[PDB]
Write an enzyme that holds these catalytic residues in place. Structure first.
Site, PDB file in Angstrom:
ATOM      1  N   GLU A 170       3.891  -2.953   6.191  1.00 60.76           N
ATOM      2  CA  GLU A 170       2.668  -3.505   6.759  1.00 60.76           C
ATOM      3  C   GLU A 170       2.904  -4.441   7.930  1.00 60.76           C
ATOM      4  O   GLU A 170       2.391  -4.123   8.999  1.00 60.76           O
ATOM      5  CB  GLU A 170       1.895  -4.240   5.673  1.00 60.76           C
ATOM      6  CG  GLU A 170       1.278  -3.376   4.569  1.00 60.76           C
ATOM      7  CD  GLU A 170       0.460  -2.264   5.032  1.00 60.76           C
ATOM      8  OE1 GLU A 170      -0.111  -2.240   6.126  1.00 60.76           O
ATOM      9  OE2 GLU A 170       0.326  -1.313   4.268  1.00 60.76           O
TER      10      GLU A 170
HETATM   11  C1  LIG Z   1      -4.984  -3.451   1.181  1.00 64.30           C
HETATM   12  C2  LIG Z   1      -6.138  -2.652   1.702  1.00 64.30           C
HETATM   13  O1  LIG Z   1      -6.863  -3.126   2.552  1.00 64.30           O
HETATM   14  N1  LIG Z   1      -6.111  -1.311   1.560  1.00 64.30           N
HETATM   15  C3  LIG Z   1      -7.151  -0.393   1.981  1.00 64.30           C
HETATM   16  C4  LIG Z   1      -6.697   0.408   3.141  1.00 64.30           C
HETATM   17  O2  LIG Z   1      -6.465  -0.366   4.217  1.00 64.30           O
HETATM   18  C5  LIG Z   1      -5.302  -0.263   4.998  1.00 64.30           C
HETATM   19  C6  LIG Z   1      -5.551  -0.407   6.478  1.00 64.30           C
HETATM   20  C7  LIG Z   1      -4.284  -1.103   6.968  1.00 64.30           C
HETATM   21  C8  LIG Z   1      -4.302  -2.049   8.151  1.00 64.30           C
HETATM   22  O3  LIG Z   1      -4.613  -3.248   8.048  1.00 64.30           O
HETATM   23  N2  LIG Z   1      -4.224  -1.424   9.345  1.00 64.30           N
HETATM   24  C9  LIG Z   1      -4.036  -2.241  10.589  1.00 64.30           C
HETATM   25  C10 LIG Z   1      -5.341  -2.307  11.375  1.00 64.30           C
HETATM   26  S1  LIG Z   1      -5.114  -3.502  12.664  1.00 64.30           S
HETATM   27  O4  LIG Z   1      -4.485  -4.735  12.185  1.00 64.30           O
HETATM   28  O5  LIG Z   1      -4.510  -2.745  13.746  1.00 64.30           O
HETATM   29  O6  LIG Z   1      -6.483  -3.797  13.119  1.00 64.30           O
HETATM   30  N3  LIG Z   1      -3.882  -2.051   5.814  1.00 64.30           N
HETATM   31  C11 LIG Z   1      -4.440  -1.511   4.508  1.00 64.30           C
HETATM   32  C12 LIG Z   1      -3.261  -1.006   3.623  1.00 64.30           C
HETATM   33  O7  LIG Z   1      -2.300  -0.549   4.556  1.00 64.30           O
HETATM   34  O8  LIG Z   1      -7.625   1.286   3.660  1.00 64.30           O
HETATM   35  C13 LIG Z   1      -8.633   1.772   2.884  1.00 64.30           C
HETATM   36  C14 LIG Z   1      -9.575   2.579   3.709  1.00 64.30           C
HETATM   37  O9  LIG Z   1      -8.790   3.570   4.432  1.00 64.30           O
HETATM   38  C15 LIG Z   1      -9.098   1.109   1.623  1.00 64.30           C
HETATM   39  O10 LIG Z   1      -9.423   2.150   0.658  1.00 64.30           O
HETATM   40  S2  LIG Z   1     -10.904   1.935   0.278  1.00 64.30           S
HETATM   41  O11 LIG Z   1     -11.397   3.266  -0.077  1.00 64.30           O
HETATM   42  O12 LIG Z   1     -11.102   1.168  -0.944  1.00 64.30           O
HETATM   43  O13 LIG Z   1     -11.671   1.797   1.519  1.00 64.30           O
HETATM   44  C16 LIG Z   1      -7.930   0.401   0.945  1.00 64.30           C
HETATM   45  O14 LIG Z   1      -8.563  -0.767   0.473  1.00 64.30           O
END
Ligand SMILES: CC(=O)N[C@H]1[C@H](O[C@H]2C[C@@H](C(=O)NCCS(=O)(=O)O)N[C@@H]2CO)O[C@H](CO)[C@@H](OS(=O)(=O)O)[C@@H]1O
Length: 185
Positions: A73
């Site tokens: 992450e």
């Molecule tokens: C812990 C948690 O949030 N997990 C969730 C996960 O999310 C990712 C996104 C990434 C992330 O932050 N990406 C970076 C984006 S940025 O910083 O570039 O803006 N970090 C998380 C795990 O890797 O995505 C889902 C929807 O696709 C949720 O399923 S759900 O069905 O319940 O929705 C899970 O809840």
């Protein structure tokens, strides 16, 4: 007790795809690349080893599994801007997505690791119900890959990671975890 949901060392993994390993500058993929990246973040990682162990014991989850997610992450913090992910949706060491979860605590403390692991633990539990014929170890992997793309993406054992980021989220994270069991987590 950290073995309620399976043991990471019994999971089968292909490691990091080349979409994960090239960016990082490796010339190889799979488990070797997974472990090598993991090893790069260990100094930084070791900065939070007590918080990572407290919460894993708290939550009956294996500290190696938490270190594996943290290395993937945010690189144990390294790639973050005040705990923010570069597109600004993810927060903290485990990158809790703010669109999906209101983030709690400070980006590198225990309140934040607890919340990330609680989320991890709900998806593991969600996969235990969805697939009861699986083994705990298989449900642990499922959980981990659901952690990234939602349990709805876990349809199968074998193609669970297609649709995750880089099509290797739980494979990667499971191989970095195995490296951290080998080194203090
Ligand atoms: C812990 C948690 O949030 N997990 C969730 C996960 O999310 C990712 C996104 C990434 C992330 O932050 N990406 C970076 C984006 S940025 O910083 O570039 O803006 N970090 C998380 C795990 O890797 O995505 C889902 C929807 O696709 C949720 O399923 S759900 O069905 O319940 O929705 C899970 O809840």
């Amino acid at each position: 007790r950290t073995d309620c949901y399976g043991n990471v060392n019994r999971i089968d993994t292909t490691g990091a795809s080349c979409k994960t390993a090239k960016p990082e500058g490796l010339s190889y993929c799979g488990v070797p690349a997974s472990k090598t990246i993991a090893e790069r973040d260990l100094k930084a990682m070791d900065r939070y080893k007590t918080i990572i162990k407290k919460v894993g014991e708290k939550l009956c989850v294996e500290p190696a599994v938490i270190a594996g997610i943290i290395s993937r992450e945010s690189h144990a913090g390294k790639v973050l801007k005040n705990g923010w992910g570069d597109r600004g949706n993810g927060f903290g060491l485990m990158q809790v997505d703010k669109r999906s979860h209101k983030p709690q605590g400070t980006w590198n403390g225990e309140v934040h690791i607890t919340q990330g692991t609680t989320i991890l633990t709900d998806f593991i539990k969600r996969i235990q119900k969805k697939f009861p014929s699986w083994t705990k170890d298989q449900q642990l992997k499922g959980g981990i890959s659901a952690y990234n793309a939602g349990a709805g993406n876990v349809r199968s054992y074998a193609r669970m990671d297609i649709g995750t980021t880089h099509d290797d989220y739980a494979n990667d994270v499971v191989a970095r975890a195995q490296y951290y069991k080998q080194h203090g987590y």
